[PDB]
Amino acid sequence: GLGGYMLGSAMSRPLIHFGSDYEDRYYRENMHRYPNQVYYRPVDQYSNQNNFVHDCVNITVKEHTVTTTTKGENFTETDIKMMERVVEQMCITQYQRESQAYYQ
C-alpha cells in the first residue's frame, strides 16, 4: 500500500546523541541494523511538511520493522525511537536539500 513512493539512495547516517556512552556505541556498533535510506515522496506532488515527513517516517519505520519481524529479528523500545530519530533526521535532511534547490 506504499503506492510506489521515492526511496532515497543510501545516506549519511545522522549521529544520534542519546546522552550516554552505552547507546552512543550501541548505535555505532549495529548502525546497519537501522536503515541508511529514507522512503519518502518527491516534493513534486503532495508538497507538505508534516503530511510528507511523518508519512515518510511512518512507512519507512513500518516497512523496516515489518521486514525484521518477518525475518525473525526483533527491535527493543530504544531501537524504535532510534529509527524514529534517525529516519526523521535523514528525511528532513533530504527535504532541506531538495526544497532548497526547488526554491533556487
Swiss-Prot record:
Disulfide bonds: C56-C91
Superkingdom classification of source: Eukaryota
Residues bearing attached sugar chains per UniProt: N58, N74
Subcellular location(s) of the protein: Cell membrane; Golgi apparatus
Family of this protein: Belongs to the prion family.
Biological role: Its primary physiological function is unclear. May play a role in neuronal development and synaptic plasticity. May be required for neuronal myelin sheath maintenance. May promote myelin homeostasis through acting as an agonist for ADGRG6 receptor. May play a role in iron uptake and iron homeostasis. Soluble oligomers are toxic to cultured neuroblastoma cells and induce apoptosis (in vitro). Association with GPC1 (via its heparan sulfate chains) targets PRNP to lipid rafts. Also provides Cu(2+) or Zn(2+) for the ascorbate-mediated GPC1 deaminase degradation of its heparan sulfate side chains.
Pathology linked to this chain's protein: Variations in PRNP are responsible of transmissible bovine spongiform encephalopathies (BSE), a class of neurodegenerative diseases that affect various mammals. These diseases are caused by abnormally folded prion proteins. BSE can be subdivided into at least three groups: classical, H-type and L-type, with the latter 2 collectively referred to as atypical BSE. Susceptibility or resistance to a BSE disease can be influenced by at least 3 factors related to the host prion protein: protein expression levels, number of octapeptide repeats, and specific polymorphisms.
Subunit structure, interactors included: Monomer and homodimer. Has a tendency to aggregate into amyloid fibrils containing a cross-beta spine, formed by a steric zipper of superposed beta-strands. Soluble oligomers may represent an intermediate stage on the path to fibril formation. Copper binding may promote oligomerization. Interacts with GRB2, APP, ERI3/PRNPIP and SYN1. Mislocalized cytosolically exposed PrP interacts with MGRN1; this interaction alters MGRN1 subcellular location and causes lysosomal enlargement. Interacts with APP. Interacts with KIAA1191. Interacts with ADGRG6.
Recorded domain comment: The normal, monomeric form has a mainly alpha-helical structure. The disease-associated, protease-resistant form forms amyloid fibrils containing a cross-beta spine, formed by a steric zipper of superposed beta-strands. Disease mutations may favor intermolecular contacts via short beta strands, and may thereby trigger oligomerization.
Protein name per UniProt: Major prion protein
Organism this protein belongs to: Bos taurus
Portion of the parent chain present: 135 to 238 of 264
